[PDB]
Structure formats: structure tokens, C-alpha cells
Amino acid sequence: SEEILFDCLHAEIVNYCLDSNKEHDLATLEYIGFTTGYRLIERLTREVSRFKDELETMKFICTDFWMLIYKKQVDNLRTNNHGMYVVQDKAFRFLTRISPGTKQLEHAPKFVAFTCGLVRGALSNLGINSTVTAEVQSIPACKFHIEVNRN
Amino acid sequence: MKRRDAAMEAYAAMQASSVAEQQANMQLCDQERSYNHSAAIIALLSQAMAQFKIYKCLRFRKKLAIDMAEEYLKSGDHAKALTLYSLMLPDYRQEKWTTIFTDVLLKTLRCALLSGSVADYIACSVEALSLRHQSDQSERILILENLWQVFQGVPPMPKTQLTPEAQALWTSALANVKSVEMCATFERVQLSNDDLLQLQLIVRVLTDIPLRIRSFHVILADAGNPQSYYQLFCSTEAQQFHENTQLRIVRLEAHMGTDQVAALLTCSSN
């Protein structure tokens, strides 16, 4: 399928390892990519009301995105006492290509950065408001904690 | 507003050679000539102002405020127009959108020259030269000349509009008046009471036209203890002050061309 093109292209994304930036990719890839994902979202089950506010959890858009992109939803999806929260997956799609031995962790956060710094929304749990860091304790088990950029 | 414009039209049709009682109709106009103060216009603007402010609609009421000032312009009443513009212009810069920002800017130019709040005049003119690239370069040059004039205090050039009365009015000014972008950086702060800082502040001009390369100033600070591209010698730090104090200047205040950018453009540190 149309997965191996992105797999290889991302392998080269990693490959250039210039000694200037820990972000081989900037959040631009993010913005444009989930902008296309938003093109996929021409319908979303959110009310039409101008007088009332209904929130679309970034968790749900994250999981649907992932099925559209990473093809395996959250295994643990925990809501932190803040407005922020954490996502935990026993396995990751890009990480299925490598054994669970902790040898080169630092690549995987650059992989999943594609969900970092996403063009936000106003309300809490509104679909796309995303500031997040990757804290991966186990090689397939990828973990990512978000932080509310405001407050 | 259209009422008053139609009144202007009435004056126009009057400027013609002006039997079924059209003179009474003209007398009508004369009656209508009475309600030309258009201050009631200003008051209706005031009611709309407050009415929209009721639900705290700042933008819309602000633009009605620029409406008010524009009307005072039409009436020739520069003072209160300048007042409301003085309120709006920091607002408009906060809206970051330079276009109408500049449009009300030249409005303010007219307002301040007519009033003679030449301090305010030059403040708006200088933050206008900051990014004036949307306007004519030659007018930037003229306005820069006006800048040196006012810093000297000598009458500014836009005499093309000026008339002697308000001219003298602002000649009175500036006896009381007391006081493009670049970047500030620091190579080293929080020293061990042995280091030596130096000019890490890159003086950049974004105006196409140069400003005369006159001179420099640095201002010393006291935290804890009391102690295109153009760069020229300043040796800002050679005084071996005490440790762990990051003296970040409130404003640049170097004497390039004239005193300064005054209108609130200064960055913090590295």
C-alpha cells in the first residue's frame, strides 16, 4: 500500500543528521499534514450552535487521525489533573519496523513530532489544540504527554 | 453623515444662480443651512459608541471613534479628533495591521500639525517611518527632514498645508516637550565579577532612506548593586562592574540622527 513511500521518506528525514537542530523536521510538516487531515474532516459530530459551545476532544481526532495515519488507536488514554493529559501506546507503527531493544530512542520522538504544535483551537478539547512532548519509556510503548501552552 | 454631505451639495446647488416658492425651498435650505453644525452627528456617534460598548464591543466602538475623529476633521476641529486618534493609534498598532494603521496615521499627521501636538505628531511619524514601505519613499524623506526640524524645533516642512496661525501655535510648543528597528542581544550576562560585556546590539535601519549617522548613547542600569546595516564604535562595556547583574536597557536612546524611536520599540535581552 501507500505506506512504504512515507516509511522510506521518513527514514531519510532521519538520515540527514546535521549538527544544528534536534528537529530534523519543523512543525511545518505538522501544520500542512493535519491541514490535509482536516480536508478529510468535512464532517465532524459537533453541534451547529452559535450560542452554545461543544468540545471535540483532541483525543478523538488523534485516534481517528491515527487510524488514517498510524492505523492503531490509543491503548492508554489518560486525562491528567490539568487541562493536559497523556497518551500511551504499547506499540507504534514506525516502531514495528524495529525490535523493542532500547538502542536509538531519539528517532521515535522525531517521528511522532508530526502531532506536535498543531494549529490550535480556542476551547479545551476542541480537536486540534496541541502542544505536546514525547517521553518514551519503552521502544514499542511510545508515550506522549501534552502541556497546555497557555497557562 | 449623508445629511451633511447633502448639505454640502445644497451649498453647491446654491452656488448656482441660486416661481413656485423655490426661494422658500431655498429658504428651506437656509433652514437646513442651520442644522449644519453636525455636532449632533458627533453625539449620535457617542450614543452608538456607548451602545456597542454595552456588550463590550471594543473594535466596533473604536472604529466609530475613528469615525468621530474623521468628522472633527471634516468640521476642521483637529483637537478632539487628535484626542481620539491618540487613543486609537496604539490600538491600531496593536491590531498589527499597518494599512488602516497608516491611513489613520496620515490622518494624525494632519491632526497634530493643525493642533501642534508636535510631540505626538513626530511620535506617529517615526513609528510610521518604522515600516513606511507601503508609502512613497520621497515623502519618507520629507518626513525625515521634518524629524530633524522638530528635534531642532525649527518649523517643519509640510507648510504646503500649514497656515500661519496654527504654525505659531506649535511654535509655542516643544518648550514644554521633554523626552527602522534594530535588535538587542547579549553575548554574556551574569558574570563572575571579572567579565567584560560589549556591543552586542545590532543597530539596523529598515527604512530605505538613511538617518544621519550622528552619535550614540548607552544608559547604565542598577539591579542589585548600582553598577542597511550600520555599526560604529561605542565600547558599551569596559567598566568591570559587579557580578550577576543583567543590565538590559529600557530603551536604546543612542543619538542616531536624532534622540530616538521614542514610541516604545525596545527588546529585552539575549
Binding site: 500542512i32 490535509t36 482536516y38 480536508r39 459551545d53 468540545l55 | 491590531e95
Partner: protein, 138 residues
């Protein structure tokens, strides 16, 4: 009849084009139209317009013979046109389609990486596609 096609970021007017069924708006209405659009957008945003669903807002504003539609993307982008009438033969489903296509062109320009977000829509190719949308609606 005239339409003003406008995309709106946080505070500025990235791309506004003042065109008609015949050509660009010869009338000196540029600044007045831009100011009215910005004020309407700010007031509506303060009220609630910031929302998750792609927000449809027909006749959310009503100027002198120019009726406005606002649209909201969850990515915080706004879109405006007007119709030069208190009444003229047109539809609203066409508005839905045209601003859906406007979103499509928006994201296809967002594809252009040289375009950093929050800038004027500089490319004459993209802008001629936009005025082709204009021809589609006037």
C-alpha cells in the same frame, strides 16, 4: 454585483480581492470594505464564532447592499464575501460549495511551504485560481 473574497487569520487580512461580475471593483470602496469586514469578524469571534465545527454564518452582517457570510475552520481561519444588493438572484448552496472550494485552495496553497502561514496570498497562480472562483460566483 461585486464580491470581495477574503481569507482572514488572527487579526490581519491576508488576502482580500475586491472584484465584480465584470472586473475588479473600480469604486473606491477598498478601505471601507476592509474595515467593515475586520470589525464584523472581531465582534463575532468575541461572541462565539470560535468553534469546532466548520462554522457557517450567512447574513451575519449586513452593510449597504452588501450581505456577508463568515466561515470558520477548526484551524482558526475565516472567509468573507459580499453581494452588491439588498436583493439579487443567487443562492446559498452555491456559497457552501464556493467556500468549500475556497478551503480546498487554501489548504492547497498551505501545501506551498515557501508560504509561511499568516501572509498575503502572493502567488498569481493561486490568486488567478481565486479569481476563477470569482468567475464561478461572479
Amino acid at each position: 454585483m461585486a464580491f470581495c473574497i477574503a481569507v482572514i487569520g488572527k487579526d490581519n487580512a491576508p488576502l482580500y480581492l475586491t472584484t465584480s461580475d465584470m472586473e475588479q471593483e473600480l469604486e473606491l470602496q477598498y478601505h471601507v470594505n476592509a474595515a467593515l469586514d475586520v470589525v464584523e469578524e472581531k465582534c463575532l469571534i468575541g461572541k462565539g464564532a470560535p468553534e469546532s465545527k466548520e462554522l457557517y454564518l450567512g447574513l451575519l452582517y449586513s452593510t449597504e447592499n452588501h450581505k456577508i457570510y463568515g466561515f470558520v475552520t477548526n484551524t482558526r481561519v475565516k472567509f468573507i464575501v459580499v453581494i452588491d444588493s439588498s436583493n439579487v438572484a443567487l443562492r446559498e448552496n452555491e456559497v457552501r460549495a464556493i467556500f468549500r472550494n475556497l478551503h480546498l485552495l487554501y489548504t492547497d496553497a498551505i501545501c506551498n511551504p515557501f508560504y509561511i502561514p499568516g501572509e498575503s496570498l502572493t502567488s498569481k497562480k493561486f490568486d488567478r485560481a481565486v479569481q476563477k472562483l470569482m468567475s464561478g460566483t461572479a
